[PDB]
Structure formats: C-alpha cells, structure tokens
Design an enzyme around this catalytic site. Structure first.
Site, PDB file in Angstrom:
ATOM      1  N   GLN A 151       0.846  -1.186   0.000  1.00  0.00           N
ATOM      2  CA  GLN A 151       0.000   0.000   0.000  1.00  0.00           C
ATOM      3  C   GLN A 151       0.882   1.236   0.000  1.00  0.00           C
ATOM      4  O   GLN A 151       1.884   1.286   0.717  1.00  0.00           O
ATOM      5  CB  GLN A 151      -0.955   0.042   1.202  1.00  0.00           C
ATOM      6  CG  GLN A 151      -1.877   1.271   1.178  1.00  0.00           C
ATOM      7  CD  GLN A 151      -2.951   1.240   2.234  1.00  0.00           C
ATOM      8  OE1 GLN A 151      -2.947   0.386   3.120  1.00  0.00           O
ATOM      9  NE2 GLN A 151      -3.881   2.191   2.155  1.00  0.00           N
ATOM     10  N   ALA A 167       0.615   5.891  -1.067  1.00  0.00           N
ATOM     11  CA  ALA A 167      -0.213   7.079  -0.932  1.00  0.00           C
ATOM     12  C   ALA A 167      -1.451   7.068  -1.823  1.00  0.00           C
ATOM     13  O   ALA A 167      -2.358   7.877  -1.594  1.00  0.00           O
ATOM     14  CB  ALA A 167       0.617   8.331  -1.223  1.00  0.00           C
ATOM     15  N   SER A 168      -1.516   6.189  -2.820  1.00  0.00           N
ATOM     16  CA  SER A 168      -2.633   6.193  -3.755  1.00  0.00           C
ATOM     17  C   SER A 168      -3.459   4.921  -3.706  1.00  0.00           C
ATOM     18  O   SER A 168      -4.695   4.993  -3.643  1.00  0.00           O
ATOM     19  CB  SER A 168      -2.133   6.411  -5.191  1.00  0.00           C
ATOM     20  OG  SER A 168      -3.221   6.276  -6.093  1.00  0.00           O
ATOM     21  N   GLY A 169      -2.819   3.751  -3.745  1.00  0.00           N
ATOM     22  CA  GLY A 169      -3.550   2.515  -3.917  1.00  0.00           C
ATOM     23  C   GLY A 169      -3.099   1.402  -2.992  1.00  0.00           C
ATOM     24  O   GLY A 169      -2.052   1.477  -2.342  1.00  0.00           O
ATOM     25  N   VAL A 172      -2.359  -2.721  -3.197  1.00  0.00           N
ATOM     26  CA  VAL A 172      -1.954  -3.663  -4.241  1.00  0.00           C
ATOM     27  C   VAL A 172      -2.134  -5.087  -3.727  1.00  0.00           C
ATOM     28  O   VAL A 172      -1.749  -5.405  -2.596  1.00  0.00           O
ATOM     29  CB  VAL A 172      -0.507  -3.421  -4.703  1.00  0.00           C
ATOM     30  CG1 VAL A 172      -0.110  -4.439  -5.788  1.00  0.00           C
ATOM     31  CG2 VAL A 172      -0.346  -1.989  -5.224  1.00  0.00           C
ATOM     32  N   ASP A 231       8.476  10.251  -8.329  1.00  0.00           N
ATOM     33  CA  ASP A 231       8.365   9.537  -7.059  1.00  0.00           C
ATOM     34  C   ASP A 231       9.348   8.372  -7.029  1.00  0.00           C
ATOM     35  O   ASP A 231       9.019   7.259  -6.616  1.00  0.00           O
ATOM     36  CB  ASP A 231       6.922   9.089  -6.825  1.00  0.00           C
ATOM     37  CG  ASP A 231       6.628   8.782  -5.365  1.00  0.00           C
ATOM     38  OD1 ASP A 231       7.393   9.265  -4.500  1.00  0.00           O
ATOM     39  OD2 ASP A 231       5.610   8.086  -5.093  1.00  0.00           O
TER      40      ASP A 231
HETATM   41  N1  ADP Z   1       3.543  -5.403  -9.624  1.00  0.00           N
HETATM   42  C1  ADP Z   1       3.912  -5.542  -8.337  1.00  0.00           C
HETATM   43  N2  ADP Z   1       4.507  -6.649  -7.852  1.00  0.00           N
HETATM   44  C2  ADP Z   1       4.872  -6.768  -6.560  1.00  0.00           C
HETATM   45  N3  ADP Z   1       4.666  -5.790  -5.635  1.00  0.00           N
HETATM   46  C3  ADP Z   1       4.080  -4.630  -6.004  1.00  0.00           C
HETATM   47  C4  ADP Z   1       3.657  -4.441  -7.396  1.00  0.00           C
HETATM   48  N4  ADP Z   1       3.110  -3.213  -7.511  1.00  0.00           N
HETATM   49  C5  ADP Z   1       3.154  -2.663  -6.266  1.00  0.00           C
HETATM   50  N5  ADP Z   1       3.732  -3.490  -5.380  1.00  0.00           N
HETATM   51  C6  ADP Z   1       3.950  -3.212  -3.938  1.00  0.00           C
HETATM   52  O1  ADP Z   1       2.873  -2.383  -3.503  1.00  0.00           O
HETATM   53  C7  ADP Z   1       3.363  -1.094  -3.083  1.00  0.00           C
HETATM   54  C8  ADP Z   1       2.420   0.019  -3.474  1.00  0.00           C
HETATM   55  O2  ADP Z   1       2.362   0.078  -4.899  1.00  0.00           O
HETATM   56  P1  ADP Z   1       2.372   1.466  -5.676  1.00  0.00           P
HETATM   57  O3  ADP Z   1       1.985   1.193  -7.116  1.00  0.00           O
HETATM   58  O4  ADP Z   1       3.704   2.121  -5.369  1.00  0.00           O
HETATM   59  O5  ADP Z   1       1.154   2.268  -4.951  1.00  0.00           O
HETATM   60  P2  ADP Z   1       1.085   3.837  -4.497  1.00  0.00           P
HETATM   61  O6  ADP Z   1       0.908   4.710  -5.734  1.00  0.00           O
HETATM   62  O7  ADP Z   1      -0.088   3.861  -3.557  1.00  0.00           O
HETATM   63  O8  ADP Z   1       2.396   4.054  -3.770  1.00  0.00           O
HETATM   64  C9  ADP Z   1       4.715  -0.950  -3.756  1.00  0.00           C
HETATM   65  O9  ADP Z   1       5.549  -0.078  -2.982  1.00  0.00           O
HETATM   66  C10 ADP Z   1       5.203  -2.381  -3.754  1.00  0.00           C
HETATM   67  O10 ADP Z   1       5.673  -2.749  -2.458  1.00  0.00           O
HETATM   68 MG    MG Z   2       4.329   3.810  -4.498  1.00  0.00          MG
HETATM   69 MG    MG Z   3       2.085   6.323  -6.210  1.00  0.00          MG
END
Ligand code: ADP
Ligand code: MG
Ligand code: MG
Length: 297
Positions: A32, A34-36, A38, A143
């Site tokens: 998780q 700041a946006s989503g 996962v 970022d």
């Molecule tokens: N494709 C992926 N495979 C494995 N872990 C992932 C993947 N995408 C995201 N994550 C994990 O989830 C976290 C949050 O994803 P992210 O896309 O950076 O969301 P946000 O925009 O909320 O920061 C990442 O920091 C990572 O630890």
């Molecule tokens: Mg992120």
């Molecule tokens: Mg982000």
C-alpha cells in the site's frame, strides 16, 4: 485544472469495460502507498498470477495524475518498467492490472539486508536505463524511491507507480507542482522552483543512500521539517562515507548536485565508471529471499 467529472470521463475512456471482481480471484494484499492498495490475484480465465492496484478516486492526493499513470504505463512499455496488463473503473474505484514481481520492492531488501557496491551498481544501472527511457519520452516520474522499485526473484529491476508522473510538453516544459515523497525530493522541488527531469536523478541519489543506510535522510522528521533540511543542507552527508569506494562516492555526488545544470543526466550517469563495478542481477536473489523470510517472520 480538471474537475472530478472531467477526470472520471477521461478515465472511463481509457480503461477496459467490465467489473474485475468477476475476472480475478484469490486476492491477497501485498502493499500500500499514498494512492492505492496492491493485491496478488489469479486471473480466473487463465490462472496467471497478477498484481492489481486498487485506487479509491476521491481519496487521491492529486486526482488528475492517475490519468498519466495508466497512459504512461501502457504507452511507454520498456524492460525496466513494470508490464501493464489492463485497467478497470467501477464507479469511484480504479483498478490497474500488471505483472506480479514476487521479489517485492527494493525497500524490503534495503531494510532487511546489506547490499554490496556491485549489487548497488547493478540496481542503479537498471534504474538509470528506465529514467533515460522515460526522460527521452518527456516523462518525469517524480516519485523515485525504493518502494517504487520492484524486483523479480531473479533480480530483475522494474520501475512502478506512475501516479505522480508528469508528461512535459513544449508549452509546459517544466513543472511546478509540489508532488513526490518529501524525503526524496530535489532541492528545486522543495524550494518551489520550476523543475525538469533531473529531479528524478536527485531522487535516485537518495535511493542509493537507502541502499547504503537503509533509509533516506530525515525519515523521522515531520515532512515540512525535512523539506527545510533539504533546502538548507543541500547534498546530504552519509553517516560513514569512508566505508564507500571513491568511485561510488563520486557517483553519489553527481546524482546529488545542488546545481541542476551540474547534476548528471540519466544518459551521462549511465557512463559513470561506478556502473562498471556491477554484479549480475542474479546476485540479488539471496538478498531477496532473505528479506522475504525475515518479513514473513
Ligand atoms: N507489480 C507488483 N509486484 C509486486 N509488488 C508490487 C507491485 N506493484 C506494487 N507493489 C507493492 O505495492 C506497493 C504500493 O504500490 P504502488 O503502485 O507504489 O502504490 P502507491 O501509488 O499507492 O504508492 C509498492 O511499494 C510495492 O511494495
Ligand atoms: Mg508507491
Ligand atoms: Mg504512487
């Protein structure tokens, strides 16, 4: 400068039709930011294990940048960029489906294990390739930090999280939005100047400090305090610079130049002799495994 309705209209025009709760199963939360949030999930039709980012649109730090996220991930495919698969919109929830990288994030590695200089050089090379590709296509990530770097179990390095990115144009060739994560922000960002792609090079420099020290400078400080410290300290100091090779210290100095014009571009830093110290990315695999085991326990 987009209304909620304009944003939702744009997102509807670029996502696929359907509800993804009917297309994926066996969800497990893996991260998780700041946006989503996962998840891993299985594609119901094929059995493929994928990663799914779920974003609630009204609880977004800057709503309209989620448009750039989908667009950049699917329009700028590259071996060092997480592979986009699909996206869906259910009212106010946006889902992005992408490849799952089971090695987790670079944060897991740097907080649980100690990378050597050859492993750091290898990761820096892959990140610089991604940045050179994005910058040459007029995308600023904004970022860059360890938790937005994903790792395959074989050490593959992929950039993710394009939700803060900017697509720069002739009419707006620089940006001025305060966006990013404070501890990784370049001084020209924190001081509210117009800035360009080299803010990502500064942030990469801070991420290389994460690979040395486990965290960026000032992580415990309130964000506004960290921003003032970035503005006044300039190039951050390491706790034990004598532990690093001269060539690695020089690489860090070129990423973390105060003067934007003196700071290296991605293409320039790809020629830095520090990257000739790189080890194969497969050398990351024992660190990745050890970090996953430590987190599990
Ligand atoms: N494709 C992926 N495979 C494995 N872990 C992932 C993947 N995408 C995201 N994550 C994990 O989830 C976290 C949050 O994803 P992210 O896309 O950076 O969301 P946000 O925009 O909320 O920061 C990442 O920091 C990572 O630890
Ligand atoms: Mg992120
Ligand atoms: Mg982000």
């Amino acid at each position: 400068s987009m209304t909620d309705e304009e944003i939702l209209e744009k997102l509807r025009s670029i996502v696929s039709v359907g509800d993804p709760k009917k297309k994926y199963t066996r969800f497990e939360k893996i991260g998780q930011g700041a946006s989503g949030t996962v998840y891993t999930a299985l594609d119901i039709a094929t059995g493929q294990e994928v990663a799914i980012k779920q974003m609630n649109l009204q609880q977004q730090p800057k709503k309209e940048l989620i448009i750039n996220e989908i667009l950049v991930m699917r329009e700028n495919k590259n071996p060092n960029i997480v592979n986009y698969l699909d996206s869906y919109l259910v009212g106010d929830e946006l889902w992005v489906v992408m490849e799952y990288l089971a090695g987790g994030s670079l944060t897991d590695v740097v907080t649980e294990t100690c990378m050597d200089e050859g492993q750091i050089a290898a990761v820096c090379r892959e990140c610089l390739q991604a940045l050179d590709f994005l910058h040459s296509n007029q995308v600023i990530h904004r970022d860059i930090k360890s938790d937005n770097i994903l790792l395959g179990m074989d050490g593959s390095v992929k950039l993710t999280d394009f939700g803060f990115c900017a697509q720069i144009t002739p009419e707006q060739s620089k940006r001025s939005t305060m966006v990013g994560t404070p501890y990784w922000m370049a001084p020209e960002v924190v001081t509210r100047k117009a800035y360009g792609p080299k803010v990502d090079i500064w942030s990469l420099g801070i991420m290389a400090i994460e690979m040395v020290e486990g965290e960026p400078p000032y992580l415990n400080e309130n964000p506004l305090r960290a921003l003032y410290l970035i503005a006044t300290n300039g190039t951050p100091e390491l706790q034990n610079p004598e532990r690093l090779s001269a060539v690695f210290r020089d690489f860090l100095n070129r990423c973390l130049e105060m003067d934007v014009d003196r700071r290296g571009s991605a293409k320039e830093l790809l020629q830095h002799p520090f990257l000739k110290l790189d080890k194969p990315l497969s050398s990351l695999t024992p660190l990745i495994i050890a970090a996953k085991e430590a987190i599990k326990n």
